[PDB]
Amino acid sequence: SFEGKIALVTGASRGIGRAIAELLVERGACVIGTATSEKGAEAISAYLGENGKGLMLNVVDPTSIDTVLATIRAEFGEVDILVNNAGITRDNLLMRMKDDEWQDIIDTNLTSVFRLSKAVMRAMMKKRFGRIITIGSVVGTMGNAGQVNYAAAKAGVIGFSKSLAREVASRGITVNVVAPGFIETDMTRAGILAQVPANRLGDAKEIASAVAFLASDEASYISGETLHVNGGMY
Amino acid sequence: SFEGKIALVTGASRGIGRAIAELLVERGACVIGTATSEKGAEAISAYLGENGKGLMLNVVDPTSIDTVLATIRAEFGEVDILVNNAGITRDNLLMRMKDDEWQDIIDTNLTSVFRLSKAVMRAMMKKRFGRIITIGSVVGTMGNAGQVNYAAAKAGVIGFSKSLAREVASRGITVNVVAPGFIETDMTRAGILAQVPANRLGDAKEIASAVAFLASDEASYISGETLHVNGGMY
Amino acid sequence: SFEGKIALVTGASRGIGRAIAELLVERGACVIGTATSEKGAEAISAYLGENGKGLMLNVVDPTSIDTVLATIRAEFGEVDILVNNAGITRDNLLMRMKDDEWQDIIDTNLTSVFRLSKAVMRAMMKKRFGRIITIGSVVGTMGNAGQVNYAAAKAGVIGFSKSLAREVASRGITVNVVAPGFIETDMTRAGILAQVPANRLGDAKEIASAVAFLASDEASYISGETLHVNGGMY
Amino acid sequence: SFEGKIALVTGASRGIGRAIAELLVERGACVIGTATSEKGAEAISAYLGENGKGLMLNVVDPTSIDTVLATIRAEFGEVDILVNNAGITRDNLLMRMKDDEWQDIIDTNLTSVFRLSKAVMRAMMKKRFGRIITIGSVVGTMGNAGQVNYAAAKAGVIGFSKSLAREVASRGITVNVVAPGFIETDMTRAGILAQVPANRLGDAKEIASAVAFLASDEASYISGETLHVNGGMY
């Protein structure tokens, strides 16, 4: 259980972020989900209830980060747990990929982790406790065609986490990555099922479970690690 | 919790095996720890209580495996969870390493996993549920000097688990590995602490936590994975 | 030998880039080394001779890339081989790392690879032959403290290369990474020697050898691979 | 070139072992290929010519190893280069896999490497130069269904090599692994071609090239490494 802990889950509107936010709430956490719109933030608040609050965050905007965090520090307190699930895709072959499509993915999926991690670190070091978890992807390891930007960002996240893990290990702060396989998405056959040995798509809840485990005090000695939830895939 | 589950922990006399056995008992499991001697088995029974039983097992002996399992099936029931923590070391440089020292490690740390995994598989497939977890080591990945046999076995275990994971994924059976770092042992300074970023040795309980998580229904979609608990090391 | 091949080595002024450029020239290549200054470009031309030319390139500047490539296409021809050795470091702990220091490393060490790779790809696909090699680092895999940006970029490079490798494999184009260990640098004891088993620092020539091998027709079936030259380290 | 070098290639009768033996001969090596039968040894001698000799070797038999090596030391000299390509398969699901089928693979593909490596090490350390290369497999890393024994052995080989690499790095001896993908075999469609991005099966020559590169003086700083030749696969 996360009694008295404050967890910040970016992109907590639906799917994995929502599952993670809901599961953390269920186990006594003070969760704070984010969206890119006030509407989504309200939608988040609605299902979070009095246990947490939904806020509008733009991971690419430093100002937004500062503002949202200031709100979090003012209303609730210092962030003990950080879940980076904010991410987008701009798929294209190498040819036909605009600088925009590359840079956006880099800014949203990689640089954001640096910014947000950097923003909450001091309080964690001070408090002698911290959890930084980033939802990565299997294609950050495999990777995948038409996703050079995504694979680059998601590999970069692993590198970042492993590099950071060595930096703040002695201070009871762990930095890890969770890599989902083919999870059940809003979008969703044979191509996906054939790849996975388990013969079934993963559930967001299953990812939330992994994150929740890494977030708990039972994973205090696990850091700079990449946990793969893909049902035998890869 | 593991209500109504039967867990077989090999080498459950002290340290990691004991922690794992104790933690599984604590969460409603019917645990069955093993030793190489009847004395150790009794010692295991003593601390397990009415929740489980300590038995004498020789992983290198097929007859012993059959006997012990027959006892387990007769008294308790089919093994739902299998924890392979039986292992030894015969350290030596490549020169100066007897065929005996190599073969013993191979037989005890690698072939045993095949035998025991093979022994309990049918009931798991039939039952449409199974957990096979092997306690590996960081030197199975790094690895380490004067431990070619140990590293070979412990890498082989990972290969085995990953190969098996693909075989029985569709049947709700997962096969994973847990790799401890420098855990607090009966034997136990700067050399070990310097290597680890966390600045502290891991606890058996922390390993037990990881195993217990992999054993639970919250890791149903994690298979063929190697979870490293080393506090930022490696 | 690289008879009739055109190789573009970024950051070919000294050390590894120079070794790579020199070794490629030695084996019949038409090499084209780059620097950030005209002075360095001249310095490159001086030691390359009539076999190649030194040009001024700014990997972060699209205009510069277009210009330099236009020069290369006009004077010599289409790039058959691409060696990405352009890279910098802005070391700092996570706290105390300016957005500038992060972004510069990301732009120079990661986005550059995307741009340059994208720029030369069409001719390679058309020509049904291509070599894209990026000089990475061991800390992109380990990684290292006070180098989150560097590790992120250098992991991202691996992700990128692996993702791209799947994209253009059928067209006889390979995309790989070379990761040096502690190579003899302009800067350069026990700390470095203790980490390396080989008891000695690597030489730029040794890296050049690896790159040259990957560049040759003997590595036509090696793609999306990361070759580590670190003398038993890691 | 390998002028004045003595190379021992196990299982050098056809395919990859033959390619490796032929390519090493071509570049000035004194090669010594092996078979399990005198017929195969003669067949090897026939195509090797006066540059080398074909001998009968049984990797599972210590006596055979001692004898063959004694012959090699008497006739030619100390082994400078060791290529382990001796290997077999006994495919079966976990259930239905006899102890025999497991143990044979372990003895032939894993323990052999230990024995042969151990046998030639002293001369290499003495001579301050050595090359130990083992032909592994992609399924030692992936791995594969119905091949738990093979995957275990081939992962164990990697562990062994990495463990050994740290042991003898300072003495100018390197221990590496080459992992082929779907190479053109005596046996050999869509299933294999679909898996490989390159859209073609690898050639034994391509593997021989990799081994030859690792064997040469241009890979003196590459040790404990696993080079994957699979044309973008994995």
Author numbering:
A (entry chain A), B (entry chain A), C (entry chain A), D (entry chain A): 2 to 189, 197 to 242
Provide text from the study.
FabG enzymes are members of the short-chain alcohol dehydrogenase/reductase (SDR) family (also known as the short chain oxidoreductase or SCOR family). The refined structures of the two crystal forms of YpFabG reveal that the protein contains a typical Rossmann fold motif, comprised of a seven strand twisted β-sheet surrounded by eight α-helices. The YpFabG tetramer is formed through two types of interfaces.
Recombinant YpFabG crystallised in two different crystal forms; YpFabG crystallised in the presence of TMAO (YpFabG TMAO) diffracted to 2.5 Å and contained one monomer in the ASU, with electron density visible for 234 of 244 residues (residues 2–189, and 197–241), and was refined to Rwork/Rfree values of 0.220/0.255. Despite very similar crystallisation conditions, the YpFabG TMAO crystal displays P42212 symmetry with a single YpFabG monomer within the ASU, whereas the YpFabG NaBr crystal displays P1211 symmetry with four YpFabG monomers within the ASU arranged to form a homotetramer. Overall, these secondary structure elements are arranged in a topology of β1-α1-β2-α2-β3—α3—β4-α4-β5-α5-β6—α6-α7-α8-β8. These secondary structure elements are clearly observable in the YpFabG TMAO structure, with only residues 190–197, which form part of the helix-turn-helix motif comprised of helices α6 and α7, and the loop region connecting the two helices, unmodelled due to disorder. In comparison, this region is ordered within the YpFabG TMAO structure, and adopts a conformation almost identical to that of E. coli FabG in complex with NADP+.
